[PDB]
């Protein structure tokens, strides 16, 4: 699909069976999703945005859906205020800018 | 111009004579560029990031030249690590995401 950006480009993700909302960021190196437990193995990470940096657990080779899209990789957990895709999974299902 | 994001979406800008770097971004409202001088008048404002909030200047109708494509509109000026071109402009040179 095309989505323009008059509104916040939200989409409907799939991961460990929960549905979530989440923001498609292209200003985003990583993907981050708010605190949770996913399976397996993780290491403490530290990344920064505006305003500051937050800590987080990275957790390696996760599958999210994104709008029925496969996509596996490097997904972090923590404090933020939005579910964040990054580029690390837009990649993953062939997201582009376009203009 | 259709970018992918193996890399950051590092486009050419030009603002106020001055050609800077700056990063297409979906995940943002928001344009927030580095600090620098502009003409006409401008507001205090608040915005938050994945760390916090910083304290930035807002300037209406700003002429800014963003990958050979003209946008006038808000431009927030502040302590950025980035140049960031938010949804504000982006929407203004017709840019999409796409996959
Ligand atoms: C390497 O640095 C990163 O890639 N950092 C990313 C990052 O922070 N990416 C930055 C760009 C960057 C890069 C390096 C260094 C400083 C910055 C812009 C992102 O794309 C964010 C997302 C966001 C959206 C919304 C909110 C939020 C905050 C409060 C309430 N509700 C929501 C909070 C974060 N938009 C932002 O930070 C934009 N925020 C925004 O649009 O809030 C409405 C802003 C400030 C640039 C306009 C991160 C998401 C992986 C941590």
Same mark, same amino acid.
């Given at each position: 699909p095309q989505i323009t950006l008059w509104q916040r480009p939200l989409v409907?993700?799939?991961?460990?069976?929960?549905?979530?909302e989440?923001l498609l960021d292209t200003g985003?190196?990583?993907? @981050? $999703?708010?605190?949770?437990? $996913? #399976?397996?193995?993780?290491?403490?990470?530290?990344?920064?945005?505006?305003?500051?940096?937050?800590? &987080?657990?990275?957790?390696?080779?996760?599958?999210?859906?994104?709008?029925?899209?496969?996509?596996?990789?490097? &997904? $972090? @957990?923590? #404090?933020? #205020? @939005?579910?964040?895709?990054?580029?690390?999974?837009?990649?993953?299902?062939?997201?582009?800018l376009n203009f």
């Amino acid at each position: 699909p095309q989505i323009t950006l008059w509104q916040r480009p939200l989409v409907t993700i799939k991961i460990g069976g929960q549905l979530k909302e989440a923001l498609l960021d292209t200003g985003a190196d990583d993907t @981050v $999703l708010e605190e949770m437990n $996913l #399976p397996g193995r993780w290491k403490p990470k530290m990344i920064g945005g505006i305003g500051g940096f937050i800590k &987080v657990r990275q957790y390696d080779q996760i599958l999210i859906e994104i709008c029925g899209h496969k996509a596996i990789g490097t &997904v $972090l @957990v923590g #404090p933020t #205020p @939005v579910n964040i895709i990054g580029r690390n999974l837009l990649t993953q299902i062939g997201c582009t800018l376009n203009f």
